[PDB]
């Protein structure tokens, strides 16, 4: 039951960390309508994190969403490197959202047919939200890439900046393989076709170039992160670390 | 003239003035200012609350805080819609907000220095807004009143969550209790000032239905018991029940402070407008992009 | 002995918080020579913080520099609002440094004649360092204000941005007054002439304008801060909060 | 030829080559590259260490960390000075560093994920650099050798502090001990790669390099293993053992393929390190221009 715990935790960690990033945007968006959308997506993602983290705690037989979020350190977090990247400008944020949304849609479509009932049920809620996310993020990819000269250039720089982290989306380890062989999990390697089909298309439709660099960065899943995660956790966990074991 | 008579009649018989209807220009203008400032308030208020999203103590509370901030953006949008039915443009009054030519609720010029501040804003500050908004539900201008009804149904829910977050602190560790008391100490008087100073045309026109003092009185009458439920004190030595009137009498509001705050010389005035300005300026390339893409 | 503790703590807190800010600049300066200088100034200031904080702990009869730095929360910190301002660009950082250095020089010059031996001794060390700081910061004020069109404009925006926080430099409360009446402390109000003499001159010599806005922001000394301090303490205190009471 | 002959004789008798002396172009370009990459390393190395300044656990340790970073910037400056005595310009080779045309020590492409990493960098990574630098103290180019002596006196002091910080963790709580072990596990091999793979023909003959990479690595391991044991920690190498027959600790096979990815910009932090220096340089332009304009008045 250990591998199942780790697998559920990872999905929760992706959603949790991305949620944190989107939270920093609150009141700082280019339009009110965007502020609203970013808050909404962040809220959806937080909801999925709570569902995945709660299930992970249940599986482990101890803790809850809060002990998992607030008492683990960076070497124990298992989110994808992509979701811990800084917000940068709006293009940076849209690029990251897009890559994650495409992946989420591909993953949850398949994961709702999981032989694990609770994972299937969570994925069934998640997919509905992920589709709205992909519409938003693909929408802006189009608007920015196929906008002005300035905006299209920023959108391309954003895609180039994040590109190397996309390899982790299709990296499979012992946990993924064992569980996909049991029909419980999706083998990430098999997500590449659907992902590339959507993303390659979207990038092309936005008059941009798919980068030629072969993506090479992994590690998040095994607790090996960029120097970004640590400072995020310091901010997120502060209050729980100052006053542990309390009710709020 | 005769229009300014059927109008006076519609106000008396409590019939809703709609956008297409005739109305005096002065009434049109004071409504643009009020609905406009109300809309600005929803937008600026996102900042002090948003300051704690990434730091909120539990995923439950974090989720509640995001939901509330999302709603504020939504309510900002309803109120801008409602303002535009009077002929003004939203980017125009928005710019006046950025210039200082239009104002927003004074309460959002105070900093959130602890997690309790969020609970207290949710409970006290929103408590004050709800009183003010329920009171504006029978305002004479139809699109404004209908908006007030829609907003009140949703906002009171969030205000209850605010109070529950405060109850968690009040029933918690000693440090949590002190955190709460401190937040109350810093937010009590600024909350009382939200209602405004101690109107001729507005009351006659039924834009405003109650005086500032009346509304403040009822806020205090309803809030003091809640403060007691939490085992907390109010930072007012002169707060006492008066069995003659049947109201709580309370100390003088420091109006010098209120005047500094609304004139841009409060604690966070500069930081709030700087944040909105920077958001607007740095967002220009994004808005232009959306425009250009639509034209294709 | 309580007022003396609070007075020493404030001076410590000013130096500590400014030190943190300067630490963020490490490896990110426009020139190597500037990186070195900023690291050096940060180091000096950290030294003064350690001296002031150590003395504060001695006076209180409990704790040390580390319990004072890492276990107080934002409402217990008593630094000037000026030192917690974000780094912004290099002009923002120089403006802040300049205002603080002018103040430090004026303060420590007088505070080395304090009737409290330990405060006198600390100030005697501090002043030597402060003079170097003022030279650096005044130097760059001149170079930036009297540089290009672009740089002078950035330097003026920087001065305007910080100006309102200068009022706290000359704000005096019960603690300042009582101790100045005992010849132990300097009454901050009496620092204005020396400070304005230096700063008004420097600004003029840099071809810039002293802002016309009357400075109005105070609170830091009583634990009432901008929204900047909190996130700083979260980063600074993380490790001590995660693993309290430990040796490092 | 006689210029070449007077030179090769100087090298063999270890008469120190000076800036004004005649020298083969290859020799000059090799030294520019080595001193230049050594300077780049001092500069880039500020980043992984500086990442922890604002988070350091005590004011004592924070002060020590700031001191060390200040020293690295200073040593960067000496080495750029020393590079320029050979005819290159510092902003020129700096730009080559930003382009990827010039490299820096591979160790700085690894992330600092805990406080222990700082201690371990201070101890291990600087232990490795001190072995390398003491070895360069008798390099044939005078300005470089003199720089090496100056740097070594100061740098070894900081390396001792690095070890003391690790000792604090090794003697502390169980969590502190685990933090240390994890840092060691992540930095041990990258530290061994610092010395380079198993050029050298000309460099050794010219006495630019005095020892082989393998020789220096061996001497690092022989001197480090005992310090690992002093801390009650383990080295993540199953094949590590002492060899009485020769008198050295032998170690496992280093993966030189990893090393190749790292120096070719495909390590963990390569992008982030160059992005940080570039951004610092680009966004600093208006500042450097301002200083230029102000001088001209």
Curated annotation (Swiss-Prot), chains A, C:
Induction of the gene: Activated by cAMP receptor protein (CRP), integration host factor (IHF) and by phenylacetyl-coenzyme A (PA-CoA) that prevents PaaX from binding its target sequences. Inhibited by PaaX.
Annotated residues for binding of substrate: 76-79, 177-179
SUPFAM superfamilies: Ferritin-like
Organism: Escherichia coli (strain K12)
Entry GO terms, CC: cytosol; phenylacetyl-CoA 1,2-epoxidase complex
Signal peptide from the UniProt entry: none
Gene3D superfamilies: 1.20.1260.10
The name this protein goes by in its record: 1,2-phenylacetyl-CoA epoxidase, subunit C
Biological function: Component of 1,2-phenylacetyl-CoA epoxidase multicomponent enzyme system which catalyzes the reduction of phenylacetyl-CoA (PA-CoA) to form 1,2-epoxyphenylacetyl-CoA. The subunit C may be essential for structural integrity of the alpha subunit.
Database matches in InterPro entries: Aromatic_CoA_ox/epox (IPR052703), Ferritin-like (IPR012347), Ferritin-like_SF (IPR009078), PaaA_PaaC (IPR007814), PaaC (IPR011882)
Assembly information from the UniProt record: Forms a stable heterotetramer (dimer of heterodimers) with PaaA and a stable heterodimer with PaaB.
Residue ranges that the Swiss-Prot or TrEMBL entry lists as coiled coil: none
GO BP, one annotated term: phenylacetate catabolic process
UniProt pathway annotation: Aromatic compound metabolism; phenylacetate degradation
Domain of life (superkingdom): Bacteria
Swiss-Prot record, chain B:
Protein name: 1,2-phenylacetyl-CoA epoxidase, subunit A
Its EC number(s): 1.14.13.149
Conditions for induction: Activated by cAMP receptor protein (CRP), integration host factor (IHF) and by phenylacetyl-coenzyme A (PA-CoA) that prevents PaaX from binding its target sequences. Inhibited by PaaX.
Swiss-Prot/TrEMBL keywords: NADP, Oxidoreductase
Lineage: Bacteria, Pseudomonadati, Pseudomonadota, Gammaproteobacteria, Enterobacterales
BP terms from Gene Ontology: phenylacetate catabolic process
Residues annotated to bind substrate: 33, 37, 103-106, 132, 193, 208, 212
NCBIfam families with a match to the protein in the record: PA_CoA_Oxy1 (TIGR02156)
Catalytic activity: phenylacetyl-CoA + NADPH + O2 + H(+) = 2-(1,2-epoxy-1,2-dihydrophenyl)acetyl-CoA + NADP(+) + H2O
InterPro entries per the UniProt record, alphabetical: Aromatic_CoA_ox/epox (IPR052703), Ferritin-like (IPR012347), Ferritin-like_SF (IPR009078), PaaA (IPR011881), PaaA_PaaC (IPR007814)
Quaternary organization: Forms a stable heterotetramer (dimer of heterodimers) with PaaC.
Organism: Escherichia coli (strain K12)
Coiled coil: none
Pfam family, one: PaaA_PaaC
Pathway listed: Aromatic compound metabolism; phenylacetate degradation
């Amino acid at each position: 039951s250990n591998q199942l715990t780790a697998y559920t935790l990872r999905l929760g960690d992706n959603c949790l960390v991305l949620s944190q990033r989107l939270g920093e945007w609150c009141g700082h968006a280019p339009e009110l309508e965007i502020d609203l959308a970013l808050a909404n997506i962040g809220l959806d993602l937080l909801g999925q994190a709570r569902n995945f983290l709660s299930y992970a705690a249940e599986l482990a037989g101890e803790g809850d969403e809060d002990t998992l979020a607030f008492t683990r350190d960076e070497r124990q977090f298992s989110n994808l490197l992509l979701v811990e990247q800084p917000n940068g400008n709006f293009a940076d944020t849209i690029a990251r959202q897009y890559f994650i949304d495409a992946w989420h849609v591909a993953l949850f479509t398949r994961l709702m047919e999981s032989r694990d009932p609770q994972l299937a049920a969570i994925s069934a809620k998640a997919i509905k939200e992920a589709r709205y996310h992909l519409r938003f993020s693909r929408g802006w990819l189009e608007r920015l890439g196929n906008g002005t000269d300035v905006s299209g250039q920023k959108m391309q720089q954003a895609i180039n900046k994040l590109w190397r982290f996309t390899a982790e989306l299709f990296d499979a380890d012992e946990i993924d393989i064992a569980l996909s062989e049991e029909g419980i999990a999706v083998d990430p390697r098999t997500l590449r076709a659907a992902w590339e089909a959507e993303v390659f298309a979207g990038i092309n439709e936005a008059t941009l170039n798919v980068p030629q660099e072969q993506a090479y960065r992994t590690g998040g899943k095994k607790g090996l992160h960029t120097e970004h995660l640590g400072p995020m956790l310091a901010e997120m966990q502060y209050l729980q670390r100052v006053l542990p074991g309390q009710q709020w | 003239s005769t229009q300014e008579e059927r109008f006076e009649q519609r106000i008396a018989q409590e019939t809703a003035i709609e956008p297409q209807d005739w109305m005096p220009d002065a009434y049109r203008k004071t409504l643009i200012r009020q609905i406009g400032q109300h809309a600005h308030s929803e937008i600026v208020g996102m900042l002090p609350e948003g300051n704690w999203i990434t730091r909120a103590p539990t995923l439950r509370r974090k989720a509640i805080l995001l939901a509330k901030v999302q709603d504020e953006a939504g309510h900002g949008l309803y109120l801008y819609s409602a303002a535009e039915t009077l002929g003004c443009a939203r980017e125009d009054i928005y710019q006046k907000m950025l210039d200082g030519r239009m104002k927003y609720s004074s309460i959002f010029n105070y900093p959130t220095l602890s997690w309790a501040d969020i609970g207290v804003i949710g409970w006290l500050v929103d408590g004050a807004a709800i009183v003010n908004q329920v009171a504006l539900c029978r305002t004479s201008y139809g699109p404004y009143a209908r908006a007030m009804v829609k907003i009140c149904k949703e906002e009171s829910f969030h205000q209850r969550q605010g109070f529950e977050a405060c109850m968690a602190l009040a029933q918690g560790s000693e440090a949590q209790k002190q955190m709460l008391q401190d937040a109350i100490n810093r937010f009590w008087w600024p909350a009382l000032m939200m209602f405004g100073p101690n109107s001729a045309r507005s009351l006659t026109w039924k834009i405003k239905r109650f005086t500032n003092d009346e509304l403040r009185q009822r806020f205090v009458d309803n809030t003091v018991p809640q403060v007691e439920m939490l085992g907390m004190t109010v930072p007012d030595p002169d707060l006492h029940f008066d069995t003659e009137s049947g109201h709580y009498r309370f100390g003088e509001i420091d109006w010098q402070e209120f005047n500094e705050v609304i004139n841009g010389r409060g604690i966070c005035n500069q930081e709030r407008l700087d944040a909105k300005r920077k958001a607007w300026e740095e967002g220009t390339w994004v808005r232009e992009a959306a425009l250009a893409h639509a034209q294709k």
